[PDB]
């Protein structure tokens, strides 16, 4: 059956603050793997109908530079998006995260988000990950990844 476990591609990670689509993942190294699904710049395309279980783990991290601001109210969020094929439409399957105050009092900061769901997918539909503050992403394969594996037929 079809599956996928895509780990973040460090080399390609935007340096912004607002929402962005993570458009670069590994699919054939370390734990990264893909079967009967296709990947193209962050978009995981479904080839075979079925009920899939979808999951995503995202880790944020940062180091406060000497002489940091008294406060830094961040929104660390993840969104798992599905793009329909039979009709142009993008919608959030799942979303998670939290607000954080990563001021300068604490030198280091870490935080990870985990979302998981059971959804009905069709061939042609694409799955993509969206996050805020992508510049704070942890590049490790055990830290930032998302996957999917078919469980039942439709």
């Amino acid at each position: 059956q079809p599956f996928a476990h895509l780990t973040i591609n460090a080399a390609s990670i935007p340096s912004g603050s607002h929402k962005v689509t993570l458009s670069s993942w590994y699919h054939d190294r370390g734990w990264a793997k893909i079967s009967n699904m296709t990947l193209s710049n962050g978009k995981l395309r479904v080839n075979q109908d079925g009920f899939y279980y979808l999951y995503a783990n995202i880790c944020f991290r940062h180091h406060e530079t000497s002489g940091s601001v008294p406060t830094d109210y961040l929104q660390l969020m993840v969104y798992v998006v599905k793009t329909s094929i039979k009709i142009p439409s993008s919608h959030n399957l799942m979303k998670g995260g939290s607000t954080k105050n990563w001021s300068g009092n604490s030198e280091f900061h870490f935080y990870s988000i985990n979302v998981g769901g059971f959804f009905k997918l069709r061939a042609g539909e694409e799955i993509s990950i969206q996050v805020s503050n992508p510049s704070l992403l942890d590049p490790d394969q055990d830290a930032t990844y998302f996957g999917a594996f078919k469980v039942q037929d439709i």
Binding site: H18, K19, Q75, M77, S84, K86, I87, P88, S89, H91, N92, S132
Partner: protein
């Protein structure tokens, strides 16, 4: 009046479903494409082939109002209060230019205010998100 094409006994073209409806049964050699109005709390905003309508979402946030309610043809449209804009999950206030800076571009409910330093001969010296540089 737009056309696609399925096949079983012989491939043929047939009408797509109009906005406000979803495809329930493909066109047969005998019948035209069967289209049924979208159920409550769903919609469609273009000619399509999907056999299911798009769910109206998301819900309006705390400091948001419903500009346009949900319809069979269009999705719900939420807008932030005056003086705020949608940033990720919350309607944050527009940036406030520090002493020596004056806003140059207003703040849309979908975009934050753009600030910029004043040219020679100007000294704003004010913490305001609603005032330019003064001579």
């Amino acid at each position: 009046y737009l056309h696609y094409d399925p096949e079983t006994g012989h491939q043929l073209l047939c009408d797509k479903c109009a906005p406000g409806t979803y495809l329930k049964q493909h066109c047969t050699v005998r019948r035209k494409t069967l289209c049924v109005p979208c159920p409550d709390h769903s919609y469609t905003d273009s000619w399509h082939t999907s056999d299911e309508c798009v769910y109206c979402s998301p819900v309006c946030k705390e400091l948001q109002s419903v500009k346009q309610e949900c319809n069979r043809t269009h999705n719900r449209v939420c807008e932030c209060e005056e003086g705020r804009y949608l940033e990720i999950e919350f309607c944050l206030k527009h940036r406030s230019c520090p002493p020596g800076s004056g806003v140059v571009q207003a703040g849309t409910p979908e975009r934050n205010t753009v600030c910029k330093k004043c040219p020679d001969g100007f000294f704003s010296g004010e913490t305001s998100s609603k005032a330019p540089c003064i001579k």
